[PDB]
Design a protein around this ligand. Structure first.
Ligand SMILES: Cc1cc2nc3c(=O)[nH]c(=O)nc-3n(C[C@H](O)[C@H](O)[C@H](O)COP(=O)(O)O)c2cc1C
Ligand SMILES: NC(=O)c1cc(C(=O)O)cc(-c2ccc(-c3ccccc3)cc2)c1
Ligand SMILES: O=C(O)c1cc(=O)[nH]c(=O)[nH]1
Length: 361
């Protein structure tokens, strides 16, 4: 794949010809077809959420919102794949432009608004490769499905309930996405009272599925939570027995120092400016849950060091997206190779040993 060629020539030129969204669409197409340019060592293997992951680096929700490039993403080197956010009924999302590049900050701002083909379309798309996925999962390549809610929905809880019943049987884990900053009032569902009611219904629906079709349930949270919000989330998670957390979605904050001309566009900020804010949220949730709740770290990961910092902070797995938009497919292998080297360099027998290491030092 040659990391330098992509980061210095291919990607840059591409960004100079097409707009963010068009580039994304093209990316999904090429990926789905397997038109892509490192062997995983046992050190990168991780066992959590009732599954084995050959490596802890996954593709974050948002790149493959409709589940169209799952196989191509596995081919890219990801240890697990999570498909964007799916809503019960189809919806176009916000008007364009709704995605912006901040190259000077190695960041992105997006306000898609949950553009989704809907549960039915995604359901049939995953059913067409359900058994193939069964073998991939058994092989250490799990599939996650991220659930959202429609813009005009009145009963948010019912929207997620539907997602559980329709896609739950096809996923190794489900994600209750209540941290999207582009859907009015969605984040308010992170409140203790609302989250408890919401997760109680989700878990009940999940427990009603046949055993082999019973996925783990995780909640994806924002990086803009107050200390109180985090304490409440942790409490609800332990009270209901949530299987895990996905730490920090994009941020509505705008860290001082941003240079991008489009820094003041409305939307969620991703990439490097979000990295440490995300790592710190992971560190806090890990401690609040006594390290007993699996955490998938996401936010500004572009190197082995970025991944290990989140792992040491408490993440059992990590994900990336924005880095892919700047460095291209080669970034996946780069992250894995650097993570492996750093693990050895720091005396860790493997990823598992480093999980939460900072809390024990
Ligand atoms: C263009 C774009 C679309 C996204 N769409 C979703 C989504 O539908 N659901 C979700 O849970 N997160 C979504 N995210 C958030 C990512 O999954 C991730 O939480 C965040 O971008 C931080 O990781 P990164 O800095 O490596 O991109 C999106 C991010 C971007 C940049
Ligand atoms: N928002 C995005 O998802 C996004 C934004 C941009 C951008 O330039 O803004 C670029 C990409 C992108 C384009 C092509 C490839 C690719 C795939 C297979 C083989 C070679 C290259 C990967 C990522 C995605
Ligand atoms: O579809 C979107 O706008 C979206 C959803 C989400 O969870 N995060 C994000 O940054 N964008």
């Amino acid at each position: 794949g040659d990391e330098r060629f992509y980061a210095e020539h291919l990607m840059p030129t591409l960004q100079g010809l097409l707009d963010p969204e068009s580039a994304h669409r093209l990316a999904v197409r090429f990926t789905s077809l397997g038109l892509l340019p490192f062997q995983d060592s046992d050190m990168l293997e991780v066992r959590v959420l009732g599954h084995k992951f050959r490596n802890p680096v996954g593709i974050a929700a948002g790149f493959d919102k409709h589940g169209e490039a799952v196989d191509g993403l596995y081919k890219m080197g990801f240890g697990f794949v999570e498909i964007g956010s799916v809503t019960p009924k189809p919806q176009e999302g916000n008007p364009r432009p709704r995605v912006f590049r901040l190259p000077e900050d190695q960041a992105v701002i997006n306000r898609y608004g949950f553009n989704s083909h809907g549960l039915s379309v995604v359901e049939h798309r995953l059913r067409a490769r359900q058994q193939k996925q069964a073998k991939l999962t058994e092989d250490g390549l799990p599939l996650g499905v991220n659930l959202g809610k429609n813009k005009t929905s009145v009963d948010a809880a019912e929207d997620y309930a539907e997602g559980v019943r329709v896609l739950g049987p096809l996923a190794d884990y489900l994600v209750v996405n209540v941290s999207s900053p582009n859907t009015a009032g969605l984040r308010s569902l992170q409140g203790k009272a609302e989250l408890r009611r919401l997760l109680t219904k989700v878990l009940q629906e999940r427990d009603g599925l046949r055993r082999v079709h019973r996925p783990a349930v995780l909640v994806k949270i924002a990086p803009d939570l107050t200390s109180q919000d985090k304490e409440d989330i942790a409490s609800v998670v332990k009270e209901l027995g949530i299987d895990g957390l996905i730490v920090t979605n994009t941020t509505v904050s705008r860290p001082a120092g941003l240079q991008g001309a489009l820094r003041s566009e409305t939307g969620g900020l991703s990439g490097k400016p979000l990295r440490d804010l995300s790592t710190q949220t992971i560190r806090e949730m890990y401690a609040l849950t006594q390290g007993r709740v699996p955490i998938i770290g996401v936010g500004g990961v572009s190197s082995g060091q970025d991944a290990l910092e989140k792992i040491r902070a408490g993440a059992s797995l990590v994900q990336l997206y924005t880095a892919l938009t700047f460095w291209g497919p080669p970034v996946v292998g780069k992250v894995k190779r650097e993570l492996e080297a750093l693990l050895k360099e720091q005396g860790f027998g493997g990823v598992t040993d480093a999980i939460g290491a900072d809390h024990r030092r």
